[model samples]
Target: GVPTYGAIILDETLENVLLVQGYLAKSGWGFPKGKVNKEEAPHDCAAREVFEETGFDIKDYICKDDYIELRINDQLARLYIIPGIPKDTKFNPKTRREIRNIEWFSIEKLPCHRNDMTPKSKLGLAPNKFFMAIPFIRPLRDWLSRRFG
Candidate 1:
């Protein structure tokens, strides 16, 4: 059976989304994600991984029904969007072995933009292995725009 993972694309504010760098990839950046434990629901796994990866307690955030699912290689990944993490909240990943650091990027500041590549590349942002998930960004932004704009 393929392994299952759950990820949280948490919005720290209407305009910013949280992105974390993993220890495994010095230049890659992505969301807070991890494998689902045995018998765990995807949502619970996502919430747990978010806290473990960024130290932000997301139990209070509003989780949308909409999710971004991808079948990459042998993994079945489900990424959830949870909006409205308090701007004042701090991040301190539970395990430095997995996550190296976290940053909040405004939609316009995302590294995916070709014109922004120079600056973003200088900042050490490379093509994440999860790049296939990049398409979800537009729909998420659209959803947030309609909900909070």
Candidate 2:
């Protein structure tokens, strides 16, 4: 499976992380990311994809070792920890074709995972607006605690 790269951008107060929304099969909220292009360097892919999605460049702030990576079903995603960005920084996607909206989500309020439907005798997780971004939330919170708190 292909590898994707991006950043979890945080505002100065460290209270929020940026999220992007897409349409169709890509619908729902998620961190801004894109599949690595031909022969693209990993960090370069992250910066390019992030910039394209948020119109904010992160190349200068990306700490090479500061990131969270996860592998599920053989597909890998790596999001660099980019903190201290000003919340006032304007974000405009390079193309509306893929991105529908961009907003800062309070980390404390973001769901780390889906809630189960056991109460209703259902078989699986309940529907969530954050399904696309849920997988990364717990890891993000842990990383923040170790580095900042």
Candidate 3:
């Protein structure tokens, strides 16, 4: 399997739900995310991608963790949580270089599109080795939110 570095920005505004954007690569709305350069670390990649896609430099507020993965791909991802953000930041629609649609969807209302599924399923998450490790990390997200939020 090939290796790659990526970052996911988990921006939690005043609302309890997380904010996500519809990505052109996957055709599904998810947290701001993208791949890192060859020499860049996952943490830096996360911060850079978030700012590139959202126009918000929130590295100061997010914490890096091995909280992300792709059930379909062999790449591990770095996840960061933004407790809050600066109010004056600009939201230019042009910043979405790899994104096609941008919208905020609740965690409970995660999109159910064919392209949203993990490698385990033809469309999304399925019963496979890739997804088998997901449950282990799922709780860490909740734990972090509770500890930080």
For residues 89-118, write the lDDT of model 2, one tens digit per residue: 999999999999999999999998899999
Model 2 residue 100 CA deviation in Å: 0.4
**Rank list by lDDT:** 2, 1, 3
**In candidate 2, how many Å is residue 38 off?**
2.0
Write down the TM-score of every candidate.
Answer: 0.72, 0.97, 0.57
**The candidate that achieves the highest lDDT relative to the unseen native structure:** 2
Against the unseen true structure, what C-alpha lDDT does each candidate score? 0.67, 0.93, 0.48
lDDT of 1 at 31: 71
- Write one digit per residue (lDDT tens) for candidate 1, span 1-149: 44444454455556777777885443467777778888887778877888898887665662657566666665777777676667567889998888877877676656443233566556544544435336556666666677678
- What lDDT would candidate 2 get against the real structure? 0.93
Please report, as a residue range, the 10-residue window in candidate 2 with the lowest summed lDDT. Answer: 126-135
Q: List candidate 3 segments past 4 Å from native.
A: 1-14, 17-25, 65-72, 86-90, 93-97, 111-141, 144-149
Worst 10 residues of 1 by lDDT: 108-117
